[PDB]
Design an enzyme around this catalytic site. Structure first.
Site, short mmCIF file in Angstrom:
data_model
loop_
_atom_site.label_atom_id
_atom_site.label_comp_id
_atom_site.label_asym_id
_atom_site.label_seq_id
_atom_site.Cartn_x
_atom_site.Cartn_y
_atom_site.Cartn_z
N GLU A 107 0.76 -1.14 -0.22
CA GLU A 107 -0.07 -0.05 0.09
C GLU A 107 0.88 0.97 0.14
OE1 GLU A 107 -2.72 0.44 3.39
OE2 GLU A 107 -3.55 -1.56 2.83
N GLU A 119 -13.31 5.61 -0.98
CA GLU A 119 -14.53 4.89 -0.14
C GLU A 119 -15.29 5.57 0.72
OE1 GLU A 119 -12.17 1.04 0.73
OE2 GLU A 119 -10.90 1.99 -0.78
N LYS A 137 -15.46 5.00 4.84
CA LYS A 137 -14.28 4.86 5.72
C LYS A 137 -14.21 6.43 6.60
CE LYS A 137 -10.48 2.72 3.25
NZ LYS A 137 -9.56 2.34 4.90
N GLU A 174 -9.15 9.53 4.75
CA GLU A 174 -9.75 8.21 4.53
C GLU A 174 -10.50 8.07 3.39
OE1 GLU A 174 -8.38 5.28 6.61
OE2 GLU A 174 -6.92 6.55 6.22
#
Ligand SMILES: *[C@@H]1O[C@H](CO)[C@@H](O[C@@H]2O[C@H](CO)[C@@H](O)[C@H](O)[C@H]2NC(C)=O)[C@H](O)[C@H]1NC(C)=O
Ligand SMILES: *[C@@H]1O[C@H](CO)[C@@H](O[C@@H]2O[C@H](CO)[C@@H](O)[C@H](O)[C@H]2NC(C)=O)[C@H](O)[C@H]1NC(C)=O
EC number: 3.2.1.73
Lengths: 306, 306
Positions: A232, A280, A283, A288
């Site tokens: 990541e 997303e 999150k 985030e």
């Protein structure tokens, strides 16, 4: 380059659409955090390499019962003969007492794989850059005391099974912790004129420093032959300081063009996965929800040449 | 945050009253320079963490005889089962030929602790910031030639036993030595921005610079995994240049608010002990008699929130 297919959202495109986006954009590898049936059924026969994870909530079961591990492998790996599995990542940033289940779970999954003739699929785990007690200078890289306790056995297992260690490395997060502690350009691959000397080697960015620090830390536990895979890495496009589409594009495009060259102490291509495919919405509010390369509507948040 | 309970005075409150002051003020840890019986009896069962020292005058005995070390542990540690011992600090700023007894004494105390079932109490030593030959820039940090001679074995012992090194760090003293050499704001935690640029890292206060310089020096001697504990730090309220209640409060309150985040190269909480609880009238005239947070009559010298 690979891309992490995060699914903590309620408005993402269907799996087959995503698989198609990977193919049209030239993304060679995909990281899944769980053996999602839809994604696995759709990615089979496409040539895309897959890293499939065993989520943290199933670790106890995989560690406690080798039979459960054989069942996990049968239902989630053997059931998809068309998928080009590369690694099975057992756990993601496992912490606390759960770390005691790490090696046992990896051993059990590994045994199940070899027994099925799927031994070419390597078993590993993904750790946070936070387990490094020292990252600067790289030559002094060391895991913290708590981390060293479980990392010793982990690294030794990877060395004996010829498996790499996966690390989630985020220069942005290290910099954001305290913006006054370091030049942002160092974390962003934009540190022209800056060369931080470490003995005979000169560093120009935080990514290289962190990767080399990990290598030094691993070497201290008998893992000098263990390769590192960056599972990541990315830069947010909104929700925090310096989190803008321009900075995210700059970071990610530079990352893509950089990983083929490697680091000062470890020249050569570094297998890397960008976090993440989509923003997303489920999150935490802030950075985030802004790690995506694409909006849920399939539009690029910013241009990227893979 | 912890506080050093210095006793070089003839008018301090009884030990039980001092322990009450620790509780009512929220001070979690206490550093004793000798295993004072009144203090050890009073601190038992309070939850306050205790760092107990083996004074410099008993070092040669502890180094020469394992039996003397076992006796020291029996009389000063085992005799107080209700005390939350954290570390046994062997020596404080040991200098000259006495430094040869340092490692032997630590080994003997360590061995005695293990045999008694108290292996969780770490053995360390406390050093002065004066052993640093170079502190700026932090990447160039190193011990003096003389210090390096004994520090090598000390750091190596600490690395092997997973014990931290304790350092007495005083930005005030470094500044007071030569006021033209640096801005007082840099030492007081009142600098606006980056004062020292070290490669890609920025330092805005002398405390961070010194801590990171120590880490670099330790790494050069095989101690990259050794944590640093600041066993003393403070600012005098009188008796010298810039020693006023306002400056002392500023420094100490900023230190308290600062240590939880760490330094540029070592983010995270730094265990710190403020020197000292009371002004001590039996110390040298000048700043030495004005290091206290409280006057002997128990009044605050300046408002402080722990
Ligand atoms: C990469 O670094 C360069 C050089 O520091 C940045 O360019 C400077 O940007 C500031 C913005 O306030 C300007 O005032 C300077 O004049 C620019 N320097 C030059 C030589 O033009 C650039 O912004 C950085 N890129 C990113 C994406 O952060
Ligand atoms: C901390 O720094 C500030 C800012 O430099 C000091 O406040 C300034 O002090 C000067 C005196 O030379 C005044 O002329 C300025 O007007 C003040 N600025 C502000 C915003 O108040 C302050 O005195 C310093 N504090 C300590 C304890 O040294």
């Amino acid at each position: 380059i690979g891309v992490c297919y995060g699914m903590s959202a309620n408005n993402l495109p269907a799996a087959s659409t995503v698989v198609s986006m990977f193919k049209s954009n030239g993304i060679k590898s995909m990281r899944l955090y769980a053996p999602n049936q839809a994604a696995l059924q759709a990615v089979g026969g496409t040539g895309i390499n897959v890293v499939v994870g065993a989520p943290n909530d199933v670790l106890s079961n995989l560690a406690a019962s080798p039979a459960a591990a054989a069942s996990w492998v049968k239902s989630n790996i053997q059931a998809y003969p068309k998928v080009s599995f590369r690694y099975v990542c057992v756990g993601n940033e496992v912490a606390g007492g759960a770390t005691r289940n790490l090696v046992p779970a990896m051993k059990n999954v590994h045994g199940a794989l070899v027994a099925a003739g799927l031994g070419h699929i390597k078993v590993t785990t993904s750790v946070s850059q936070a387990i490094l007690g020292v990252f600067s200078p790289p030559s002094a890289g060391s895991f913290t005391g708590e981390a060293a306790a479980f990392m010793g056995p982990v690294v030794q297992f990877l060395a004996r099974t010829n498996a790499p260690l996966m690390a989630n490395i985020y220069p942005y997060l290290a910099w954001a912790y305290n913006p006054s502690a370091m030049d942002m350009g160092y974390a962003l691959f934009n540190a022209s004129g800056t060369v931080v000397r470490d003995g005979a080697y000169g560093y120009q960015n935080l990514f290289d420093t962190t990767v080399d620090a990990f290598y030094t830390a691993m070497g201290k536990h008998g893992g000098s032959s263990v390769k590192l895979v960056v599972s990541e890495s990315g830069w947010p496009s909104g929700g925090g300081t310096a989190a803008t589409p321009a900075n995210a594009r700059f970071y990610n495009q530079h990352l893509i063009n950089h990983v083929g060259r490697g680091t000062p102490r470890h020249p050569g291509a570094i297998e890397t996965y960008i976090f993440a495919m989509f923003n997303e919405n489920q999150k935490d509010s802030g950075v985030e929800q802004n790690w995506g390369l694409f909006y849920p509507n399939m539009q690029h948040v910013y241009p990227i040449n893979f």
